[PDB]
Amino acid sequence: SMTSHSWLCDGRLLCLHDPSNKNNWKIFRECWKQGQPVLVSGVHKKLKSELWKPEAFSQEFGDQDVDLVNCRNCAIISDVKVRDFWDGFEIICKRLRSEDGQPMVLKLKDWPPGEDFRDMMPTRFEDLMENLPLPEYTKRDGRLNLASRLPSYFVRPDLGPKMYNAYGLITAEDRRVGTTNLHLDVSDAVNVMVYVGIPIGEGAHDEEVLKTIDEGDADEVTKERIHDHKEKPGALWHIYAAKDAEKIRELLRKVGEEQGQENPPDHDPIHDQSWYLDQTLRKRLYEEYGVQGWAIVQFLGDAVFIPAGAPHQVHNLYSCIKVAEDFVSPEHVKHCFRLT
Ligand SMILES: c1cnc(Oc2ccc([C@@H]3CCNN3)cc2)nc1
Ligand SMILES: c1cnc(Oc2ccc([C@@H]3CCNN3)cc2)nc1
Ligand SMILES: [Cl-]
Ligand SMILES: [Cl-]
Ligand SMILES: [Cl-]
Ligand SMILES: [Cl-]
Ligand SMILES: [Mn+2]
């Protein structure tokens, strides 16, 4: 039967089921005020599916010049055409290969560039902004979005949205690599999974995705979403409470020193965006510092709400197109104030 909401993460994560129900705020508000992330399912059913396909981005925008990142070693592939990324998104035989001959795992960097999404893609911009959940919080002029209403004593977010495009990590060695490394934002954000590409035939890798889920931190009900095989899984997130950010910096300073990095005692390993917490590091964080996080699998059409100040990292299971909007809720405005 259809219901308003359910729980994941053993009751610690709210999952809203109807992205457009006008009463969602009544359930959302208390979880948000406590500094928890929230998940909203079903946003893909509200969107124009033909606007969000890899082949359409390649046809319309393929002659633009871009840089790519090699996820495995952080090497920059400079000044290539954006079609060279899009045409290998799902079809592994058409995908760029390393010198050694393996298909690469690539991220498309800063595309569309800066604040240019609205100008470059006006029909995509309208389809996303009109269908965002919790619209009093997430729309540019929502009543509970302070972004347009604050003075210069507050860091204000850039005009959005921002698109995040990257291939899935493939091998057992790739399990310890991030798509986006551990970092935090001083604004709130909503991140929507608009497309998942699952390769078939030549370079399929379904067995290592299921291993990664079965051997990892995820709760039994999320494992009972993977195994049902009704919905496409896109990306594995880990999110930590804003109150635990300094304990995480203490662990990463200790691990940087153990690995022979030579860092001043004040340096900020979260701002550096250089670390991915693998299973070994997540267990050390729990046992040595007493810090627990939220392990979240973002499926097609899931919207992840990330509280301001919360450290987070992302690991793509399959090839993903994500679209994110920043906002400034009253609950978390302290995180962007420039004094004390
Ligand atoms: C048609 C429509 N909806 C259902 O189930 C629901 C869905 C959403 C809710 C909301 C969400 C916020 N407050 N209650 C309650 C019941 N079933 C058939
Ligand atoms: C409706 C029905 N079926 C689909 O296809 C898929 C394809 C792959 C999965 C993954 C694989 C790993 N765990 N589940 C799930 C659903 N899509 C929409
Ligand atoms: Cl467009
Ligand atoms: Cl709302
Ligand atoms: Cl990164
Ligand atoms: Cl907070
Ligand atoms: Mn982020």
Tell whether 302 is in a known binding site.
Answer: no
Closest residue by Cα to atom 17, ligand 1, is: 2
The two three-digit tokens of residue 195, written as one number? 């497309």
Residue ranges near ligand 4 (ion) with Cβ within 5 Å:
25, 134, 136
Residue 336 CA, ligand 4 centroid: distance in Å: 22
Please choose, from the candidates 11, 165, 176, 177, the residue with its C-alpha nearest in 3D space to the C-alpha of residue 89: 165
Distance 118 CA to ligand 3 centre (A): 8
Q: Whose CA is nearest to atom 13 of ligand 2?
A: 226
- Within 8 A by CB and 6+ apart from 266, the residues are none
CA-to-CA distance for 209 and 62, rounded, in angstroms? Answer: 30
- Minimum-distance ligand 2 atom for the alpha carbon of 317: 12
Architecture of domain 1-340: Sandwich (2.60)
Burial of 328 (0-12, 13-18, 19+ CB in 10 A): buried
Q: Quote the strand ranges of 137-264, DSSP E.
A: 162-166, 180-183, 188-197, 233-239
**Token pair of 313 as six digits:** 């990292």
- Closest CA to ligand 1's atom 13: 23
DSSP state of 167: P
Cα(192)–Cα(174) distance, integer angstroms: 24
Q: Where are the alpha helices (DSSP H) in the chain?
A: 24-33, 54-61, 82-86, 117-120, 122-129, 135-138, 206-215, 220-226, 245-258, 279-289
Ligand with minimal distance to 242 CA: 6
**Method by which the model was determined:** X-ray
User: Both ends of the chain: CA-CA distance in Å?
Assistant: 50
Resolution (A): 1.5
Instruction: Determine if residue 183 is labeled as part of a ligand binding site.
Output: yes
